[PDB]
CSV table of C-alpha atoms and ligand atoms in Angstrom, one decimal:
chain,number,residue,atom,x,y,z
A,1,UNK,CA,62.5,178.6,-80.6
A,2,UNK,CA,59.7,180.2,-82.6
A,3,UNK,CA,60.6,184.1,-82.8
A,4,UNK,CA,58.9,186.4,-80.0
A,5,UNK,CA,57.1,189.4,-80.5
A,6,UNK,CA,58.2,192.0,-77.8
A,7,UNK,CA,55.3,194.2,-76.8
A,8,UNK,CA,55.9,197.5,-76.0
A,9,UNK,CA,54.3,197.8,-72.2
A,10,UNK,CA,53.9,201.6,-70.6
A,11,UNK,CA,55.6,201.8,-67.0
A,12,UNK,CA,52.3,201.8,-65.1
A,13,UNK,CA,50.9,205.2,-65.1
A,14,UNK,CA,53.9,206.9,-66.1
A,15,UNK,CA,54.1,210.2,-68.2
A,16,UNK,CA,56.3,212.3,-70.2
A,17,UNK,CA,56.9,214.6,-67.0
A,18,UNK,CA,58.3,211.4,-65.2
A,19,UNK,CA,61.0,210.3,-67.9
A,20,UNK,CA,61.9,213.7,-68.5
A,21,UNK,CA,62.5,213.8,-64.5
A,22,UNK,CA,64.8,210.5,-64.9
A,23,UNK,CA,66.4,212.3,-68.4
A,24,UNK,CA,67.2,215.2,-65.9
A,25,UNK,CA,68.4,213.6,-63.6
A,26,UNK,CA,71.1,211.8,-65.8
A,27,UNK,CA,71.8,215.2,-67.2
A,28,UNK,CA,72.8,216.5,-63.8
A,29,UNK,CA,75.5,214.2,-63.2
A,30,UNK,CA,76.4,214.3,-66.2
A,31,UNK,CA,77.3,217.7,-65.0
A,32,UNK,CA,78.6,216.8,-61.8
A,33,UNK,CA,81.2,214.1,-62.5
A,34,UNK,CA,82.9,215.8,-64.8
A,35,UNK,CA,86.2,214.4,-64.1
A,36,UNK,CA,85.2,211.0,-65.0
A,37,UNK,CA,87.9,209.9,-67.9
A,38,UNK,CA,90.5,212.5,-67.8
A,39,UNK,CA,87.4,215.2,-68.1
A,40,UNK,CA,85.7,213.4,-70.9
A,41,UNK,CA,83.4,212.8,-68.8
A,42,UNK,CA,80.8,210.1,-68.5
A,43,UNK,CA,78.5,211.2,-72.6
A,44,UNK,CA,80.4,208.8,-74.5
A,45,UNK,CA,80.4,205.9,-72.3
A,46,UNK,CA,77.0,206.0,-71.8
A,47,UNK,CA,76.6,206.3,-75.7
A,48,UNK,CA,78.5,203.5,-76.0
A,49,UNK,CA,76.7,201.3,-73.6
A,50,UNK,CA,73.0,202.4,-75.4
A,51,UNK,CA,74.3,201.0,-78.2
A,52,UNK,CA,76.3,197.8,-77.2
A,53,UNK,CA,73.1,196.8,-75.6
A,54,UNK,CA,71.0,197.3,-78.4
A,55,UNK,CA,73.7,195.8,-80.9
A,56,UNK,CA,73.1,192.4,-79.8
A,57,UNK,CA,69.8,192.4,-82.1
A,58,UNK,CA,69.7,189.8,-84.8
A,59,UNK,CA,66.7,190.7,-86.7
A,60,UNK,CA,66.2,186.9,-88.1
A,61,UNK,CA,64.7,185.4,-84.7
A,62,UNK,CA,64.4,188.7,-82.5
A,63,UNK,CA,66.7,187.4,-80.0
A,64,UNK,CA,69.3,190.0,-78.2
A,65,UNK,CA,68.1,194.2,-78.7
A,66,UNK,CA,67.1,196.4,-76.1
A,67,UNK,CA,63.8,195.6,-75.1
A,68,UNK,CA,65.0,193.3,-72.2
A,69,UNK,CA,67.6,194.7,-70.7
A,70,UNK,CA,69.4,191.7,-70.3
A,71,UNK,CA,73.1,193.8,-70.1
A,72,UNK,CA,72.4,193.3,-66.1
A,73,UNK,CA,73.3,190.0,-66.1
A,74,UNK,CA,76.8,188.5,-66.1
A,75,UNK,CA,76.6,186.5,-69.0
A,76,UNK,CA,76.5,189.9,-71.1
A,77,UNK,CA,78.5,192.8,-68.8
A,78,UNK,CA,81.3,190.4,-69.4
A,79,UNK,CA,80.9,190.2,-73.0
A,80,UNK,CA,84.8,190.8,-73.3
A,81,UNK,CA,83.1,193.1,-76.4
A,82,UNK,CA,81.5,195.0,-73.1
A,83,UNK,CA,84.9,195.8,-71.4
A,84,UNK,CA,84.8,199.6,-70.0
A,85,UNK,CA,81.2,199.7,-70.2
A,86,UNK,CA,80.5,199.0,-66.7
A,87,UNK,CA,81.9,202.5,-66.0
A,88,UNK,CA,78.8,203.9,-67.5
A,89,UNK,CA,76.1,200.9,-65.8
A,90,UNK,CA,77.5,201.9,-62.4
A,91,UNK,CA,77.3,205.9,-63.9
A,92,UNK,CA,73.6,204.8,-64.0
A,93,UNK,CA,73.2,202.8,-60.6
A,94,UNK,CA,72.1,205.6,-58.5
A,95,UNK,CA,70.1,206.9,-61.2
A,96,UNK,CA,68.2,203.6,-60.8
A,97,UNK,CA,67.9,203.4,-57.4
A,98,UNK,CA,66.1,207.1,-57.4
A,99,UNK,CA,63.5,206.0,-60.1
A,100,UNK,CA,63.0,202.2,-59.7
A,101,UNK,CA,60.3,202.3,-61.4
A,102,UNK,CA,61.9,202.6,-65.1
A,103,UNK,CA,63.0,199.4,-67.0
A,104,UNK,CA,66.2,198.7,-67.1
A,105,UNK,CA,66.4,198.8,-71.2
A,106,UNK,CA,64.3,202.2,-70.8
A,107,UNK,CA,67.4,203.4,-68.8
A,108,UNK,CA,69.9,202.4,-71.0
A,109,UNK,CA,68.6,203.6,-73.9
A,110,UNK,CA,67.4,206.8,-72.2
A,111,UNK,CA,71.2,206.9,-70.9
A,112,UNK,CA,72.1,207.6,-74.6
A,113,UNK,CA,69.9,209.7,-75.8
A,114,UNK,CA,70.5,212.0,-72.4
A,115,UNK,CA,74.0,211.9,-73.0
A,116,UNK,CA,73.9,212.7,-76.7
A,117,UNK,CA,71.8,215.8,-76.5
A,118,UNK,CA,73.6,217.5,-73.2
A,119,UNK,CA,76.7,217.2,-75.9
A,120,UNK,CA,74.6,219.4,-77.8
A,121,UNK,CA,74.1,216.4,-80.4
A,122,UNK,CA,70.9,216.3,-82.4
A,123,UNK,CA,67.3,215.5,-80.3
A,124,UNK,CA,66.5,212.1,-80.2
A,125,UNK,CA,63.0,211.0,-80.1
A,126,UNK,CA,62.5,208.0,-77.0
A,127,UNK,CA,59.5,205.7,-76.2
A,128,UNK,CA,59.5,203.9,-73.2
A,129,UNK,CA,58.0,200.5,-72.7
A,130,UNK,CA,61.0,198.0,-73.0
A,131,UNK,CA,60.2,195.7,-70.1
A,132,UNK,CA,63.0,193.5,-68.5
A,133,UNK,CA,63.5,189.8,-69.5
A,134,UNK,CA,64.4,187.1,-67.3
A,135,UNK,CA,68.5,185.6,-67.4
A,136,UNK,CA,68.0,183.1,-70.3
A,137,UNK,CA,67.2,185.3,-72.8
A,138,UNK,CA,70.8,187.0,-72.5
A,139,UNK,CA,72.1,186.5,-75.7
A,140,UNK,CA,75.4,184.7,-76.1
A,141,UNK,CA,78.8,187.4,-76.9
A,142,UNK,CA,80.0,187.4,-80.4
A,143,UNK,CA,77.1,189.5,-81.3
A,144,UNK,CA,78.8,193.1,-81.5
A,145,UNK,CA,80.9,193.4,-84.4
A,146,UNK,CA,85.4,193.5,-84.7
A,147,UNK,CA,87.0,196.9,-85.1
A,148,UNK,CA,89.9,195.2,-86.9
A,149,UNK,CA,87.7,194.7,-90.6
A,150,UNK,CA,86.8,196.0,-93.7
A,151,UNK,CA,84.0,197.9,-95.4
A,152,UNK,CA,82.7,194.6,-96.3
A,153,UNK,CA,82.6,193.0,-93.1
A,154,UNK,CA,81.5,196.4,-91.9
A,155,UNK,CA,78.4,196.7,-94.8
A,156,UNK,CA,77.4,192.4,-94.0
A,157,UNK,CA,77.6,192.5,-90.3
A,158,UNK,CA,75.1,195.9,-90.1
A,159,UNK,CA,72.6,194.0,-92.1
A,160,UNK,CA,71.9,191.9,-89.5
A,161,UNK,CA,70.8,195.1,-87.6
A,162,UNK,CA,68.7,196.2,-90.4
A,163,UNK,CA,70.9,198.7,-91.4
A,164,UNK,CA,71.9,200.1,-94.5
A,165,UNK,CA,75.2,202.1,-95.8
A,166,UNK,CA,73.6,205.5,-95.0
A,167,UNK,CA,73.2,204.5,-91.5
A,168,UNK,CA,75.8,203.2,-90.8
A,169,UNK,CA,78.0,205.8,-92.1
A,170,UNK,CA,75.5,208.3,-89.7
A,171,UNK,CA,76.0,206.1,-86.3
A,172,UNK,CA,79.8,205.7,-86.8
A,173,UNK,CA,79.6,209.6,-86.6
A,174,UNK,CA,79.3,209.4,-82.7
A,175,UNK,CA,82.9,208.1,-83.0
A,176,UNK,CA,83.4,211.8,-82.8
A,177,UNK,CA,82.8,211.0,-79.0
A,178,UNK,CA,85.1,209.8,-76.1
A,179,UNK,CA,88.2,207.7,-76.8
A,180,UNK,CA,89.8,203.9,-77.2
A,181,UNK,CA,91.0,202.6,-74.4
A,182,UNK,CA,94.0,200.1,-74.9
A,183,UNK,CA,92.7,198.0,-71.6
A,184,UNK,CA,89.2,197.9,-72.8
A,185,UNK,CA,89.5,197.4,-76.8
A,186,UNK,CA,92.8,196.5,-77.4
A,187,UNK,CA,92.9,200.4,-79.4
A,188,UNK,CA,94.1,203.6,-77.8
A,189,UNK,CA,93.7,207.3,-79.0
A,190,UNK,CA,90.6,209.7,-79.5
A,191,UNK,CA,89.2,210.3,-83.1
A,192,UNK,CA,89.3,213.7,-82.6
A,193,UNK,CA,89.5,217.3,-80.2
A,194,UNK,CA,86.4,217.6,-79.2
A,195,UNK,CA,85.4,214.3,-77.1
A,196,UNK,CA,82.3,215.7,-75.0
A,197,UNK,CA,80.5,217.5,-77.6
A,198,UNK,CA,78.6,216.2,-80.8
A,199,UNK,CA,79.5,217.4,-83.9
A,200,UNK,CA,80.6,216.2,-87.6
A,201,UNK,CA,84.0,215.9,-86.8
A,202,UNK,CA,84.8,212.3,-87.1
A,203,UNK,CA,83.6,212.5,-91.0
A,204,UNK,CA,85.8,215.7,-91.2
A,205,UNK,CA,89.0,214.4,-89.3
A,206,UNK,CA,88.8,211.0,-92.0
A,207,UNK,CA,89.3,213.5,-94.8
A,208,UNK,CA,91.3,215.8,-93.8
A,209,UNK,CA,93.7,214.6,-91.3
A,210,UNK,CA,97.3,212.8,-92.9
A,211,UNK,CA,96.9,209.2,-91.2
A,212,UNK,CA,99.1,206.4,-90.9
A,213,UNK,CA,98.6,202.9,-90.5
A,214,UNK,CA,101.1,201.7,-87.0
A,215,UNK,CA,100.5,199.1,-84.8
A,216,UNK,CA,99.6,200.5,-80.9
A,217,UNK,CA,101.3,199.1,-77.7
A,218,UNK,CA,98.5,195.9,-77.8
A,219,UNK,CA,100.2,195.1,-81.6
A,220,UNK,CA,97.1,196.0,-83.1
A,221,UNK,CA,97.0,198.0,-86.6
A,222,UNK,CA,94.9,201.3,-86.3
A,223,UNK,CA,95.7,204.9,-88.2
A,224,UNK,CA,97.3,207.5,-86.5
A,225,UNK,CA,97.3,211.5,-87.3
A,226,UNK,CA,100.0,213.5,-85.6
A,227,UNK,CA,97.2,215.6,-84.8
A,228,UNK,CA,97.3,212.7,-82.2
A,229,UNK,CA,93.9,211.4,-83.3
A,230,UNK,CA,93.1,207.7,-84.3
A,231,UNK,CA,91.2,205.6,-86.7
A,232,UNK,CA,90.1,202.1,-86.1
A,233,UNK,CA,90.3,199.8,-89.0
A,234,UNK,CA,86.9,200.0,-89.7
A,235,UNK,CA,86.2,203.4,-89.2
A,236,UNK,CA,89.2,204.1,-92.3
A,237,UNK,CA,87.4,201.5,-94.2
A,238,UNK,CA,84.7,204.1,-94.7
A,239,UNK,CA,87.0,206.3,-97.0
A,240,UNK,CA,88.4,203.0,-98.4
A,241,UNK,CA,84.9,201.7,-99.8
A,242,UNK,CA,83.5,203.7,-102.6
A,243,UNK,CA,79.9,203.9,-101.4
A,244,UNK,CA,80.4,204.8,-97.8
A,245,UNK,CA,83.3,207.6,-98.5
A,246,UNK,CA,80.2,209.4,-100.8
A,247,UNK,CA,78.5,209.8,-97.3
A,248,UNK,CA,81.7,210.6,-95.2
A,249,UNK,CA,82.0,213.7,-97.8
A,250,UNK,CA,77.9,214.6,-97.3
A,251,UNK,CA,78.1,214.5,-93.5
A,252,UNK,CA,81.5,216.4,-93.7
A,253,UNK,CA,79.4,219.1,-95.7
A,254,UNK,CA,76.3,219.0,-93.8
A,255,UNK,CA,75.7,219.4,-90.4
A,256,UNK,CA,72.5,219.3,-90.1
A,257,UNK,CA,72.2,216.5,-92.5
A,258,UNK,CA,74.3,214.1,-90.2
A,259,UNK,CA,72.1,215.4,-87.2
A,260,UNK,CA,69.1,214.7,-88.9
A,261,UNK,CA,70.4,210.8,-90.3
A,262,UNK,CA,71.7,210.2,-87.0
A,263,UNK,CA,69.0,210.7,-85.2
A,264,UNK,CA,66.7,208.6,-86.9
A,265,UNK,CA,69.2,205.8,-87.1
A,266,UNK,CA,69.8,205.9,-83.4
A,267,UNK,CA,66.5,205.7,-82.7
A,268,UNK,CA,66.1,202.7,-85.0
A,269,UNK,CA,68.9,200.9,-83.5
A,270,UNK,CA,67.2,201.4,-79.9
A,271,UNK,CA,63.9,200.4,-81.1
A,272,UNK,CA,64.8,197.5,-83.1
A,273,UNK,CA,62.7,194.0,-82.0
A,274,UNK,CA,59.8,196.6,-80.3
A,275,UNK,CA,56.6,195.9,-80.6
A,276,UNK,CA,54.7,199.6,-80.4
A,277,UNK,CA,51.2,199.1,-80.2
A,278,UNK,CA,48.6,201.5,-82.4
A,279,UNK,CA,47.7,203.7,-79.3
A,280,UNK,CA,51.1,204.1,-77.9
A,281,UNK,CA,52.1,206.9,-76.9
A,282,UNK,CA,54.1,209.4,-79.4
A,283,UNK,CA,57.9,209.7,-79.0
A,284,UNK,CA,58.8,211.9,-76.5
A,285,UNK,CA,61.6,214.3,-77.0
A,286,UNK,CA,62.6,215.6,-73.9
A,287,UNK,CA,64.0,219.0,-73.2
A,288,UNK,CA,68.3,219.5,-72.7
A,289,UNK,CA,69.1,221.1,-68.8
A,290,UNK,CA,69.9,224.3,-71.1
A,291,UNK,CA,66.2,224.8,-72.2
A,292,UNK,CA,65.1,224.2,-68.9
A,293,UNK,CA,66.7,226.9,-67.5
A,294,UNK,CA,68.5,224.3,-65.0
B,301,LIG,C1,75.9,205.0,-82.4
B,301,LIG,C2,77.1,204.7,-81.6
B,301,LIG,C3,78.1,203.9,-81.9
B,301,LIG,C4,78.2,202.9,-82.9
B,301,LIG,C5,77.1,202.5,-83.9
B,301,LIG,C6,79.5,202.3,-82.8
B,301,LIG,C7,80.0,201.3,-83.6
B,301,LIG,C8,81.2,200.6,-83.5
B,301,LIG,N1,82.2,200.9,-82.5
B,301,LIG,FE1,82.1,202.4,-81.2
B,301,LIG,N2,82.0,203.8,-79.7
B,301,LIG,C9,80.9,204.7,-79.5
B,301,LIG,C10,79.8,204.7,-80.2
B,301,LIG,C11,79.4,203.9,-81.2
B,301,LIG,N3,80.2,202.9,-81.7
B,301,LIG,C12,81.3,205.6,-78.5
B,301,LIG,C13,80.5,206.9,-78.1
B,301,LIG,C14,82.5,205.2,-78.0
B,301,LIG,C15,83.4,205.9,-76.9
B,301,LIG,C16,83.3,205.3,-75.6
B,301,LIG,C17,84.2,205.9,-74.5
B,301,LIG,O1,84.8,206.9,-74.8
B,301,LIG,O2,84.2,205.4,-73.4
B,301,LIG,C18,82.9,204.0,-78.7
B,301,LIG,C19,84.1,203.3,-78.5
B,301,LIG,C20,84.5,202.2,-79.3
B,301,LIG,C21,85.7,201.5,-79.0
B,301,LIG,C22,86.7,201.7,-77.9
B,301,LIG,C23,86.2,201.1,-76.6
B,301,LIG,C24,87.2,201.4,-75.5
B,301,LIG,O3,88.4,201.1,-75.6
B,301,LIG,O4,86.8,201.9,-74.4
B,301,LIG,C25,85.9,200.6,-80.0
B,301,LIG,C26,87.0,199.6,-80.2
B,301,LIG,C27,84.7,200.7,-80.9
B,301,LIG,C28,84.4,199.9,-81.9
B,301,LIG,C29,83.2,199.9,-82.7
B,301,LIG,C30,82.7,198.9,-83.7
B,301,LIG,C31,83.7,199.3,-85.0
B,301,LIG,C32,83.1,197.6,-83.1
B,301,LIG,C33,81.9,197.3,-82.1
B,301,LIG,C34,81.5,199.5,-84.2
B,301,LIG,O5,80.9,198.6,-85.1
B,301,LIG,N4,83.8,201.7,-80.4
């Protein structure tokens, strides 16, 4: 029961030029199934599912995080917290089968930061080195948090993540991606216009926009804008608590700021429960399709 220590471990012999090859080749079909979600397309997903299997982290034993990879087994893709996500593992499939070589937490970690940086979000420094972990360290569901809270479940559950009020204010930012989905969360409705690019809007849209609490078609509260955007309870309990709505207003006057914070924090959330030894390599940060020329 003792806590484990999970040691980063180097896909043998592999490079930068290989995981930029596997980046790259997420990136393209990222490009090429563009239809995916009424032309969404498949960024936000695969956002989503980088963090929902990094989420599961509990940083008083070490058990859940990203390191194993553990989302592959049934036990967790049918988290009912998971629903929609498989979308983005079978996104990923043939992306697998081309490089089998790469972990499967390297992948899904990799997926995010890929998809956050072709939606011209900030770069995201990776290391590789999760290594997969056997069916019985799957950690039980329950561990991803409720959308139906307040700031202070919000502020106590993020703790267990390590996580503090500036970041999570920063990582509910990506909420500027994708959509609910009423069959997957129970919540239906995008936060805002532009749902394939990253950009401050979410922090902009929660200040600006005129919203209403209604209940949807699943008799679930959320805010609604006649913009025809929507807020989940806890992302409205960021303008509601004193603290976090400070931050709301920085990132909502800052780009860069909120590029910078968030790209720390989402690297922090997919490294949480690593082990990186001393001669490890660096982070790499990869290059976007665009600055290849490809
Ligand atoms: C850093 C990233 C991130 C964080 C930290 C973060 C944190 C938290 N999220 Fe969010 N998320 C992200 C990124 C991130 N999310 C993205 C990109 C999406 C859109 C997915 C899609 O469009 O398919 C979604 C979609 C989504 C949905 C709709 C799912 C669906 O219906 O398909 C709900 C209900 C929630 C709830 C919650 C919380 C409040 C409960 C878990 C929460 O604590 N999320």
């Amino acid at each position: 029961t003792t806590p484990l220590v999970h040691v980063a471990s180097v896909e043998k012999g592999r490079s930068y030029e290989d995981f930029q090859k596997v980046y790259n080749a997420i990136a393209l079909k990222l490009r090429e199934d563009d239809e995916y979600d009424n032309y969404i397309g498949y960024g936000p997903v695969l956002v989503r599912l980088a963090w929902h299997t990094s989420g599961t982290w509990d940083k008083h034993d070490n058990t859940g995080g990203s390191y194993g990879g553990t989302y592959r087994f049934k036990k967790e893709f049918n988290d009912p917290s998971n629903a929609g996500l498989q979308n983005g593992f079978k996104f990923l499939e043939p992306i697998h089968k081309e490089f089998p070589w790469i972990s499967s937490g390297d992948l899904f970690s990799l997926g995010g930061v890929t998809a956050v940086q072709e939606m011209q979000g900030p770069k995201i420094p990776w290391r590789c080195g999760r290594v997969d972990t056997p069916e019985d360290t799957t950690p039980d569901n329950g561990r991803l948090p409720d959308a139906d809270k307040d700031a202070d479940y919000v502020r106590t559950f993020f703790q267990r993540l390590n996580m503090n009020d500036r970041e999570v204010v920063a990582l509910m930012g990506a909420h500027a991606l994708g959509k609910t989905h009423l069959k997957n969360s129970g919540y239906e409705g995008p936060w805002g216009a532009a749902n394939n690019v990253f950009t401050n809007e979410f922090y902009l849209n929660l200040l600006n926009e005129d919203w209403k609490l209604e209940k949807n078609d699943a008799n679930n509260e959320q805010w609604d804008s006649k913009s025809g955007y929507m807020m989940l309870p806890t992302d409205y309990s960021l303008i509601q608590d004193p603290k976090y709505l400070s931050i709301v207003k920085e990132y909502a006057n800052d780009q860069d700021k909120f590029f910078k914070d968030f790209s720390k924090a989402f690297e922090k959330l997919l490294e949480n429960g690593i082990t990186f030894p001393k001669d490890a390599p660096s982070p790499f940060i990869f290059k976007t399709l665009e600055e290849q020329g490809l």
